[PDB]
Write an enzyme that holds these catalytic residues in place. Structure first.
Site, PDB file in Angstrom:
ATOM      1  N   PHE A 138       0.882  -1.153   0.000  1.00 25.07           N
ATOM      2  CA  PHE A 138       0.000   0.000   0.000  1.00 25.07           C
ATOM      3  C   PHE A 138       0.921   1.205   0.000  1.00 25.07           C
ATOM      4  O   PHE A 138       1.841   1.300   0.814  1.00 25.07           O
ATOM      5  CB  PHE A 138      -0.892   0.022   1.241  1.00 25.07           C
ATOM      6  CG  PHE A 138      -2.012  -0.963   1.183  1.00 25.07           C
ATOM      7  CD1 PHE A 138      -1.763  -2.332   1.284  1.00 25.07           C
ATOM      8  CD2 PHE A 138      -3.316  -0.529   0.965  1.00 25.07           C
ATOM      9  CE1 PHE A 138      -2.801  -3.260   1.165  1.00 25.07           C
ATOM     10  CE2 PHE A 138      -4.359  -1.444   0.842  1.00 25.07           C
ATOM     11  CZ  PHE A 138      -4.103  -2.809   0.941  1.00 25.07           C
ATOM     12  N   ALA A 139       0.700   2.117  -0.932  1.00 27.34           N
ATOM     13  CA  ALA A 139       1.536   3.303  -0.995  1.00 27.34           C
ATOM     14  C   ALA A 139       0.617   4.500  -1.178  1.00 27.34           C
ATOM     15  O   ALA A 139       0.211   4.820  -2.292  1.00 27.34           O
ATOM     16  CB  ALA A 139       2.530   3.190  -2.153  1.00 27.34           C
ATOM     17  N   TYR A 143       4.019   8.136   0.695  1.00 29.44           N
ATOM     18  CA  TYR A 143       4.662   6.836   0.544  1.00 29.44           C
ATOM     19  C   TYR A 143       4.905   6.381  -0.889  1.00 29.44           C
ATOM     20  O   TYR A 143       5.664   5.438  -1.117  1.00 29.44           O
ATOM     21  CB  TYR A 143       3.883   5.761   1.310  1.00 29.44           C
ATOM     22  CG  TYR A 143       4.109   5.827   2.802  1.00 29.44           C
ATOM     23  CD1 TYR A 143       3.205   6.480   3.643  1.00 29.44           C
ATOM     24  CD2 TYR A 143       5.262   5.291   3.367  1.00 29.44           C
ATOM     25  CE1 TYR A 143       3.456   6.596   5.019  1.00 29.44           C
ATOM     26  CE2 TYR A 143       5.522   5.401   4.736  1.00 29.44           C
ATOM     27  CZ  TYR A 143       4.620   6.054   5.554  1.00 29.44           C
ATOM     28  OH  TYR A 143       4.891   6.170   6.902  1.00 29.44           O
ATOM     29  N   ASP A 181       5.399  -3.730   3.690  1.00 29.38           N
ATOM     30  CA  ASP A 181       5.344  -2.269   3.704  1.00 29.38           C
ATOM     31  C   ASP A 181       6.243  -1.805   2.564  1.00 29.38           C
ATOM     32  O   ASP A 181       7.198  -2.502   2.189  1.00 29.38           O
ATOM     33  CB  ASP A 181       5.853  -1.714   5.040  1.00 29.38           C
ATOM     34  CG  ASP A 181       4.797  -1.770   6.146  1.00 29.38           C
ATOM     35  OD1 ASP A 181       3.662  -2.230   5.891  1.00 29.38           O
ATOM     36  OD2 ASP A 181       5.116  -1.350   7.273  1.00 29.38           O
ATOM     37  N   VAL A 182       5.943  -0.622   2.034  1.00 30.93           N
ATOM     38  CA  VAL A 182       6.676  -0.062   0.904  1.00 30.93           C
ATOM     39  C   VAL A 182       7.946   0.730   1.251  1.00 30.93           C
ATOM     40  O   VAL A 182       8.856   0.827   0.424  1.00 30.93           O
ATOM     41  CB  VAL A 182       5.725   0.834   0.064  1.00 30.93           C
ATOM     42  CG1 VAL A 182       5.470   2.142   0.797  1.00 30.93           C
ATOM     43  CG2 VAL A 182       6.305   1.079  -1.325  1.00 30.93           C
ATOM     44  N   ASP A 183       8.022   1.296   2.458  1.00 30.71           N
ATOM     45  CA  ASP A 183       9.212   2.060   2.825  1.00 30.71           C
ATOM     46  C   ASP A 183      10.323   1.121   3.274  1.00 30.71           C
ATOM     47  O   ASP A 183      10.843   1.209   4.396  1.00 30.71           O
ATOM     48  CB  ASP A 183       8.908   3.114   3.909  1.00 30.71           C
ATOM     49  CG  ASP A 183       8.175   2.552   5.119  1.00 30.71           C
ATOM     50  OD1 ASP A 183       8.232   3.209   6.182  1.00 30.71           O
ATOM     51  OD2 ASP A 183       7.533   1.486   5.025  1.00 30.71           O
ATOM     52  N   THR A 241       5.265  -6.188  23.188  1.00 33.29           N
ATOM     53  CA  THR A 241       4.261  -5.133  23.237  1.00 33.29           C
ATOM     54  C   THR A 241       2.892  -5.560  22.712  1.00 33.29           C
ATOM     55  O   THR A 241       2.285  -4.873  21.896  1.00 33.29           O
ATOM     56  CB  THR A 241       4.722  -3.868  22.477  1.00 33.29           C
ATOM     57  OG1 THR A 241       5.046  -4.193  21.118  1.00 33.29           O
ATOM     58  CG2 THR A 241       5.947  -3.275  23.162  1.00 33.29           C
ATOM     59  N   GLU A 290      -1.052  -4.739  13.835  1.00 38.67           N
ATOM     60  CA  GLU A 290      -0.002  -5.631  14.333  1.00 38.67           C
ATOM     61  C   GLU A 290      -0.392  -6.352  15.611  1.00 38.67           C
ATOM     62  O   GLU A 290      -0.015  -7.515  15.820  1.00 38.67           O
ATOM     63  CB  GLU A 290       1.295  -4.846  14.539  1.00 38.67           C
ATOM     64  CG  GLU A 290       2.457  -5.642  15.134  1.00 38.67           C
ATOM     65  CD  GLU A 290       3.748  -4.844  15.090  1.00 38.67           C
ATOM     66  OE1 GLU A 290       4.369  -4.784  14.006  1.00 38.67           O
ATOM     67  OE2 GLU A 290       4.128  -4.249  16.131  1.00 38.67           O
ATOM     68  N   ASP A 315      16.446  -3.345  10.474  1.00 42.97           N
ATOM     69  CA  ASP A 315      16.661  -1.901  10.455  1.00 42.97           C
ATOM     70  C   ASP A 315      18.091  -1.758  10.953  1.00 42.97           C
ATOM     71  O   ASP A 315      18.337  -1.782  12.163  1.00 42.97           O
ATOM     72  CB  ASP A 315      15.710  -1.190  11.420  1.00 42.97           C
ATOM     73  CG  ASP A 315      15.814   0.324  11.322  1.00 42.97           C
ATOM     74  OD1 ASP A 315      16.903   0.823  10.974  1.00 42.97           O
ATOM     75  OD2 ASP A 315      14.805   1.013  11.597  1.00 42.97           O
TER      76      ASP A 315
END
Ligand SMILES: [Hg+2]
Ligand SMILES: [Hg+2]
Ligand SMILES: [Hg+2]
Length: 266
Positions: A59-60, A64, A132-134, A166, A224, A247
């Site tokens: 999804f962008a 994004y 995710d796109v990023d 979490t 999530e 990351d």
């Protein structure tokens, strides 16, 4: 289905673990995918013989769309190369999707949003991978991840105790998970499986989020949180190691990660 052809490769060693530094199988006997645990030639043969098609969805929206070029270009270099791939880009800016050159047997569909069928997925692909796109691919992401249903270990919690996860902790939420429950903390940015299992998961998530909304509560980590509740109750058939969702700026490059395959963009 069909027999594999003759292949020459190192004999697996029964009294020699592939990895001694990490858990490579869950207690419900689902492989945990780490470099060194699989022979990609054997798996490629198995999946090509089945003429497997993999759908990759992203999804962008808004700002994004700027991440699409690098995402797609790197997917072309590292994602399911050699297999049939169908990219599905959901965006609010169809005219802003970059013109990316695709290898043979790979295609891209742009689906405009604000809005606008799932049956299409059932007839177009065998597996769906939702990310995710990023992000960008930096190394091999292939058929070793394919299975009826898979989740990916969140890079910030793979070494954490469950009490630190979490998860949504309020009993009032459908995503609620008490401190004495939980296998892993899965990241919502990379999951997938057969089309049928992926639609089951997204349908369950959607229903649970609506119940919470009607009840005036929003899970701590939204989608999530619900993905984690779903995978706790419906165990994934494969779990991907953090090699698949990393990351480096935030977490460096630990010795336990032999490869950094899909990473966050700075
Ligand atoms: Hg998806
Ligand atoms: Hg949802
Ligand atoms: Hg979900």
């Amino acid at each position: 289905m069909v027999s594999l052809p003759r292949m020459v490769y190192p004999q697996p060693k029964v009294l020699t673990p592939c990895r001694k530094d990490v858990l490579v199988v869950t207690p419900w006997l689902a492989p945990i995918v780490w470099e060194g645990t699989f022979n990609i030639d054997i798996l490629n043969e198995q999946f090509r013989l089945q003429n497997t098609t993999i759908g990759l969805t992203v999804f962008a929206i808004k700002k994004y769309v700027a991440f699409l070029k690098l995402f797609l270009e790197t997917a072309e270099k590292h994602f399911m190369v050699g297999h049939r791939v169908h990219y599905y880009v959901f965006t609010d800016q169809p005219a802003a999707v970059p013109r990316v050159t695709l290898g043979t047997g790979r295609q891209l569909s742009v689906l405009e949003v604000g809005a606008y069928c799932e049956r299409r997925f059932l007839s177009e692909v065998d597996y769906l991978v939702c990310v995710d796109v990023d992000m960008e691919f930096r190394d091999h992401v292939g058929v070793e991840i394919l299975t009826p249903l898979f989740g990916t270990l969140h890079p910030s919690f793979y070494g954490s105790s469950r009490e630190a996860f979490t998860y949504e902790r309020r009993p009032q939420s459908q995503a609620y998970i008490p401190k004495d429950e939980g296998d892993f903390y899965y990241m919502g940015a990379f999951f997938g499986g057969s089309v049928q299992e992926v639609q089951r998961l997204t349908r369950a998530c959607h229903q649970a989020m609506m119940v919470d909304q009607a009840n005036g509560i929003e899970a701590v980590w939204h989608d999530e949180s619900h993905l984690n509740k779903y995978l706790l109750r419906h165990k994934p058939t494969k779990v991907l190691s953090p090699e698949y969702l990393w990351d480096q700026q935030l977490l460096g490059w630990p010795a336990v990660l032999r490869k950094l395959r899909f990473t966050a963009v700075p």
